[PDB]
Structure formats: structure tokens, C-alpha cells
Design a protein around this ligand. Structure first.
Ligand SMILES: CC(C)CCC[C@@H](C)[C@H]1CC[C@H]2[C@@H]3CC=C4C[C@@H](OC(=O)CCC(=O)O)CC[C@]4(C)[C@H]3CC[C@]12C
Ligand SMILES: CC(=O)N[C@@H]1[C@@H](O)[C@H](O)[C@@H](CO)O[C@H]1O
Lengths: 123, 497, 117
């Protein structure tokens, strides 16, 4: 059982950079798979970037060369570097955690843990 | 760091093993070339057989006597039998000897090692007749000295053959072990290959294959440079001059390795080596002996051997300077084994602490691969499909020899069972604690990661392999295919009477 | 422990040949010394001996020693005959338990077999 909280965001113009971090409270965070989801006001949450316990990095839809994900086990936190932001990227970001799962890592139902989410806007 | 460590371990072990195989093959080839040039019915060298034993099974002693009598060597002078005891129970072996050989049994009241006159003429008068000696119970080393004195009093002999009371000798075993003595005058001792006849126990087969592989590779490589250290029982040869020269230094040394048994086998060979005399080993001479079937007995025996080796490392390292260019291989292999033990300890500690599934899977996979390669070589050399069973020797090695080595180091570092098995129990408890800590730390499932999938597939494949090998071994037990053909004959003969 | 039975014989003229076979039933340890004797009114004389493992001693150029090593059967065929070779041949065994020395003295051969010729 891990509780996810969000801290970051801001109002930056196009082409800016942001650093968003998620803090989890639990027993063993070193063995939990982390993921990031964003919900635009006009659509539903989608998988953008995620990191497993073995430091495996997954990206899709140009995130491979745009965003960077990393985790710090000592500080018990996970962060997602954001670079070259665009106006269409404006959405509230939700972090997810999972301990047991299968091949599916994109659907929202695969992850049994979620966070309150922080609002990110691009101007 | 784990990748570098495992790569270095693999390449270093593979290189040393390949060098040992090349050395053993070269020694075998030169020995075959030497043998191919000898004439038929060669009996130029006159040898004498010496048998020493204490509290030996009468059946095994009778079988050893029969095997000695079945030798095809036509230049055997006499047989010397010495029993370390003169009590009522010690007379059973003498009666067994009388059934197989002559009734010339002597019961002297004094010990040659503790007598003013150590010559063998004091207790023996005729050299043609075989003699049996019942000396007072002092020890294994004292028994061998009496046999040496009895063999030395006859100037006709030129070499001696030393075997144990439970050794089974082939018809051509005596000829093969004594043939290379005349090939090179610098050769003063020859070692003989030993095999384990009883393979009805899980530990017995593992130790049999370990002994066979050891004799093939380490003793072969040592014989290539003619600097063997393990020469003597249960099958070996010695020239008369060297034993006459070194009998006094061998018996004047202080012995504390074991009580009333475990004669100093390696110390005599070290005494020969320190005089600059080359010693070879031959695999054609085959001897059969039993092995312990109890894990605790095997552990304590290996602990005693480890203490003896740790005592005699200094002597065996100092004996290598006389050889000149040669002899550095002894220090090289000693450093090899020391660094191998240290690397095994360091790798185990590292995998226990870091508890990384990715590195542990690769480590166990490469260890399984190299062990499978070694087993395949053993099968190819021995022409036997049962040599693949050596892959399970890693478990017994890790669970027995390492705690035995720790105990041996602790005893000589700077409650009878406390100093023997408590260390092993603590080692087992620590291994179990490390394993449970590792499994609970990485208790998760994630099929979306290829590395996790790879680790699980690897460990599952390893478990399946070990399980099917164990199943095959279990099937072989009822089928009795794993039984040695010589073992079956002994079982049937024992059943007969 | 061991019993020696002899086969072959009969009346043969001066020109010809014959084969003498000695049979044993048991274990001889492949190290005992085996010899032959010719005459029974004269004392027994050495003819030929050889170890079971190998080797061979005459006194010939006409009599050879052969064994089988698997059937526990032995043969000693004689090429050509002369009048003074006609006698009662004996098959004898010498044990190596007392000593490994090789002697031609018949007194050392404790075990003997009945003759045929
Ligand atoms: C509490 C339970 C659930 C945990 C049980 C732990 C063991 C069953 C496993 C864990 C890691 C394994 C080890 C990893 C590495 C090695 C080195 C290997 O030595 C060699 O490399 C020999 C080289 C050659 O000559 O081929 C001997 C086996 C060993 C100790 C393995 C033995 C079996 C181990 C101890
Ligand atoms: C009968 C015999 O030779 N035993 C030796 C033993 O004395 C020695 O301590 C050990 C070390 O490897 O090797 C064994 O073969």
C-alpha cells in the first residue's frame, strides 16, 4: 500500500521545461513499478512514460526523444523530466504505482494505485 | 561491477582449466609413447608389495590379498603385511592372511621405530618367504617403517609398492606403476590412479567423479612437470634408495594430524621433492577403494585434509625452489585455488547483500554452463555417460568444503561437536538467512519487463534441469545402471557367503 | 582346493605326435607355477614350466607350452617321438603362498595329478 502525492507544474510558455516529481509513502518502494498518465480536459488518461523496478524506460508518441524518466530509491520518489513543451501538452498529470501485473502496462485498470494529480499548463 | 566480476571469474577459470587439460593430455601422450616402446614380458624391475591396515573388514582384506595374488607381474619378491596391533581383535586379519597366504606370522614384542636397532634382520631371518608382522599398536606411520625395513634388508629388490588394506588392484596395475621408474633415472616415485567402487549413495558418486576428475587433471598436470605431491596410498611406487635415505626424517617428524591412523602420505613425497627428484604419475594403474557415505564423516575427513594441507603449504612451496625453471606451477596452482576460494566467498557475499536478480541469474547460468562443459569433458575422456552427474558436485562442495575450510582455518588461527559441526550449522543458517532475505526483497511479479522475464525463465530452466537430473539419478538407482560393474560382483559374492 | 585331471595318451610309434591336456576346476589366482614331469624306475625329472600370466621355460626346440586362460584348460603338444620319451607324464601345480621363487624341484609341488601314459 503506497500513497502517491504530486508536487510541481507551473505556467511556462511554449518551449519551456518543467520538472515534476511524485512522492510515495509505503514499506518497500524499491520494488514498485511507476508510471505517468495525463488527462486532458477533452480526452481520457493515456500512458506517456513509465519506469519499472529494474530501471526499464518506456516511452511512446515522440516521448522517446522529448521526456526523460528517472527514480530515486534513496529519497523514495520518482520524477519525469519534461523538455520542449507544447501547448497541446497542457493536461493534469497522474502518477501510478503497481506491484503485480502482466503484459498490459497502458490501460488505467492495470495499475491499482493512483495519485491526486497536479495541473500542468503551457502558454 | 557484477558483470566484470563474473566475466573475470569465467575467463580465469576457463583458461586455467584449459591449461590443465592440455598438460594432462601431453603427459598422457608421452606416457603412451614411452609404453609403446617397451618389450613384451618386461620384468626387469624387482618390487615388493607392502600392505598396512588396522581394524579392516576381513572381507575387504581378503579381497585385497586376492587382488594382490592376481597380479600378472613376474618379478615380485615378497609380500609384507603389517598390522598396527597385537590384541585378540587384531588376530582376525592375521587369520585371514593365513587363509590366503602362508602361515608365517610373527608377533614381535617391540616396535622398530622405538628400538635401538631399527634393522629388519632383528625380527626377520628368511627373505624368500612371505612374512606377517603383528606390531604393537602405535600408528599408521610406524607400520610403514617396519615394511620399509623389511623390504630394505633384501638387496635384490629395487622398488616398493605401497597399497592400503582395502585397495583392489588390477592384474596389470603393478607393472604400470613400476614401468616408468626405469624410463628416467631421475624418477624416484610414481603415483597410481584410484577409483571408487561403491556408488550406491548420492555423495559416493559425487566424490567418485571428483576423485576421477582430480586424478585426470591436477595430478596429470603435476606429472607433466614431474612434481607430483600426492604419491603413496592407496596405489603408488617408491624406489629403494630414496626411501632408505628419507625414512629417518619422515619418522622423526612430529605428527598430530590424527590418532592411530592417517599416515603422512604427502610428507614423504615432500621429502622426496626437497631433494630435487622428479616424480611422475600414471593413469594406467587403476586402484579401487571405498568412500565415506556419511555427510558428517566426509566433512570431518575433508576438514582433517584441509588442516594437513594448511600445515604443509609452507613445505610444498619451499620445495619448489630446487626445481629451477620448473616448480613455479605449484605456486601458480596454489594461488589459483586460494583466489578461487576468495572469489567464491566474495561473489556469494555480493549476491547475498545486493540481492540483484539480474546478476544472480547470469552467475548461475554461467556456472551451470562451465560445469556442464567440465562434465562433458569427463564423459568424453572416460567414455561413460554417467560423468554428467558431476554437475551436482557444486551443491555438496558449497555445503561441505567451505565450512570445512573455515573450521580448518579457525582451528589453527593465531565441546567435541562444537569445534566440528557448529561452524557448519552456522554457515547453513547464514546461507538460509541470505536466501530468505533475497527472496523477500525481490518478492514481486512484472511480466511487462524483459529483464524480469529473462531472469524468471533462466531460474525456471535451471530448476527444471536440476530436477530432471535428480529424477534420472533416482531412476538409475532402481535400474542399478549407476552401480559399478565391479561393485555388483562384490555384492553378489557377499550375498553368497 | 584344486584338482588336476589329465587327458590324452595312448600308444604312439616312433614317428608321430600327440597332445596332452591337463584340466583344472577352481581358481588358481593366475600366479601359481605350473610344470610337467616325464618319468614316474627313475625319479621325476623337470620337463617344462611357465606361469599362468605368461612366460615359458624349457629343459628343447620341439615342445611348446600353451594355455587358454579362460577355460582353465592347458595343453602341451609334442612334435616327433623317440623311444625313451615314453613314460607316465604328470601334471603338477606349485603354490605361491609360501614364496614367489621359481624352483624345478618336484618336492616344492605339493599338489599332483594322476598320470595317463
Ligand atoms: C532459503 C532458500 C530459499 C535459498 C537457497 C539458496 C541456494 C539454493 C542458491 C542461491 C545461489 C546459488 C549459488 C551461486 C554460485 C555458486 C558457485 C559454484 O562454484 C563454481 O563456480 C565451480 C566452477 C567449476 O569448476 O565448474 C558453486 C555453486 C554456487 C555456490 C550456487 C549454489 C546454490 C545457491 C547457493
Ligand atoms: C590417501 C591419500 O592420498 N590421501 C590424500 C590426503 O592425505 C591429502 O590430505 C588430500 C589433499 O588433497 O589428498 C588425498 O588424496
Amino acid at each position: 500500500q503506497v500513497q502517491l502525492v504530486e508536487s510541481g507544474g507551473g505556467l511556462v510558455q511554449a518551449g519551456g521545461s518543467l520538472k515534476v516529481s511524485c512522492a510515495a509513502s509505503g514499506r518497500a518502494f524499491k520494488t514498485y513499478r511507476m508510471a505517468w498518465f495525463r488527462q486532458a480536459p477533452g480526452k481520457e488518461r493515456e500512458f506517456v512514460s513509465g519506469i519499472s523496478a529494474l530501471e526499464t524506460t518506456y516511452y511512446a508518441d515522440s516521448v522517446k526523444g522529448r521526456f526523460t524518466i528517472s527514480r530515486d530509491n534513496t529519497k523514495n520518489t520518482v520524477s519525469l523530466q519534461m523538455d520542449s513543451l507544447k501547448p497541446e501538452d497542457t493536461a493534469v498529470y497522474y502518477c501510478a504505482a503497481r506491484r503485480y501485473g502482466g503484459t498490459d502496462y497502458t490501460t488505467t485498470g492495470s495499475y491499482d494505485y493512483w495519485g491526486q494529480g497536479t495541473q500542468v499548463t503551457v502558454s | 561491477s557484477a558483470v566484470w566480476g563474473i566475466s573475470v571469474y569465467g575467463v580465469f577459470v576457463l583458461g586455467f582449466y584449459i591449461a590443465q587439460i592440455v598438460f594432462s593430455e601431453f603427459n598422457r601422450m608421452r606416457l603412451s609413447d614411452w609404453i609403446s616402446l617397451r618389450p613384451d614380458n618386461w620384468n626387469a624391475t624387482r618390487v615388493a608389495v607392502i600392505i598396512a591396515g588396522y581394524r579392516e573388514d576381513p572381507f575387504m582384506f581378503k579381497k585385497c590379498l586376492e587382488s594382490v595374488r592376481d597380479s600378472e607381474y613376474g618379478n615380485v619378491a615378497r609380500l609384507i603385511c603389517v598390522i598396527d596391533g597385537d590384541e585378540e581383535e587384531d588376530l582376525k586379519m592375521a587369520e585371514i592372511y593365513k587363509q590366503v597366504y602362508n602361515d608365517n606370522v610373527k608377533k614381535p614384542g617391540v616396535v622398530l621405530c622405538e628400538s635401538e636397532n631399527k634393522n629388519g634382520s632383528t625380527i626377520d631371518s628368511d627373505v624368500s618367504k612371505n612374512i606377517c608382522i603383528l606390531q604393537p599398536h602405535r600408528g599408521k606411520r610406524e607400520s610403514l617403517y617396519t615394511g620399509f625395513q623389511l623390504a630394505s634388508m633384501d638387496p635384490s629388490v629395487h622398488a616398493v609398492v605401497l597399497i592400503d588394506s582395502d585397495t583392489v588392484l588390477e592384474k596389470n596395475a603393478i607393472l604400470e606403476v613400476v614401468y616408468p621408474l626405469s624410463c628416467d633415472p631421475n624418477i624416484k616415485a610414481v603415483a597410481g590412479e584410484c577409483k571408487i567402487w561403491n556408488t550406491d549413495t548420492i555423495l559416493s558418486m559425487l566424490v567418485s567423479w571428483r576423485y576421477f576428475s582430480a586424478f585426470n587433471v591436477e595430478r596429470g598436470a603435476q606429472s607433466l612437470w614431474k612434481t607430483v605431491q600426492c604419491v603413496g596410498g592407496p596405489l603408488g611406487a617408491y624406489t629403494i634408495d630414496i626411501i632408505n635415505e628419507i625414512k629417518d626424517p619422515w619418522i622423526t617428524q612430529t605428527f598430530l594430524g590424527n590418532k592411530c591412523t592417517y599416515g603422512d602420505n604427502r610428507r614423504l613425497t615432500n621429502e622426496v621433492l626437497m631433494r630435487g627428484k622428479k616424480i611422475v604419475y600414471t593413469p594406467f594403474a587403476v586402484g579401487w577403494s571405498d568412500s565415506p557415505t556419511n555427510v558428517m564423516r566426509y566433512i570431518v575427513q575433508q576438514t582433517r585434509w584441509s588442516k594437513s594441507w594448511c600445515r604443509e603449504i609452507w613445505y610444498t612451496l619451499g620445495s619448489a625452489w630446487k626445481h629451477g625453471f620448473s616448480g613455479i606451477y605449484l605456486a601458480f596452482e596454489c594461488m589459483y585455488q586460494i583466489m578461487y576460494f576468495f572469489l567464491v566467498m566474495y561473489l556469494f557475499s555480493y549476491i547475498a547483500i545486493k540481492a540483484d536478480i539480474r546478476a544472480q541469474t547470469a552467475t548461475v547460468l554461467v556456472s551451470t554452463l562451465v560445469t556442464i562443459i567440465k562434465s562433458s569433458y569427463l564423459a568424453l575422456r572416460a567414455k561413460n555417460l554417467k560423468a554428467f552427474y558431476f554437475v551436482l558436485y557444486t551443491y555438496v562442495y558449497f555445503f561441505c568444503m567451505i565450512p570445512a575450510r573455515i573450521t580448518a582455518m579457525f582451528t589453527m588461527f593465531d565441546w567435541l561437536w562444537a569445534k566440528q559441526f557448529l561452524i557448519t550449522y552456522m554457515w547453513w543458517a547464514g546461507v538460509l538467512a541470505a536466501g530468505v532475505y533475497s527472496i523477500v526483497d525481490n518478492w514481486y511479479f512484472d511480466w511487462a519487463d524483459i529483464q524480469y522475464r529473462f531472469a524468471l525463465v533462466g531460474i525456471c530452466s535451471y530448476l527444471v534441469f536440476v530436477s530432471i537430473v535428480l529424477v534420472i539419478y533416482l531412476i538409475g538407482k532402481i535400474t542399478t545402471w549407476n552401480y559399478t560393474p565391479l561393485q555388483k560382483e562384490l555384492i553378489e559374492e557377499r550375498y553368497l557367503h | 582346493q584344486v584338482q588336476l585331471v589329465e587327458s590324452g595318451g595312448g600308444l604312439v610309434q616312433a614317428g608321430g605326435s600327440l597332445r596332452l591336456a591337463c584340466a583344472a576346476s577352481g581358481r588358481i589366482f593366475s600366479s601359481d607355477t605350473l610344470a610337467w614331469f616325464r618319468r614316474a624306475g627313475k625319479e621325476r625329472e623337470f620337463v617344462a614350466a611357465s606361469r599362468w600370466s605368461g612366460g615359458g621355460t624349457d629343459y628343447k626346440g620341439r615342445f611348446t607350452f600353451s594355455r587358454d586362460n579362460t577355460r582353465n584348460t592347458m595343453c602341451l603338444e609334442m612334435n616327433s617321438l623317440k623311444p625313451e620319451d615314453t613314460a607316465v607324464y604328470y601334471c603338477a601345480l606349485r603354490t605361491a603362498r609360501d614364496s614367489y621363487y621359481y624352483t624345478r624341484n618336484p618336492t616344492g609341488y605339493d599338489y599332483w595329478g594322476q598320470g595317463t601314459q
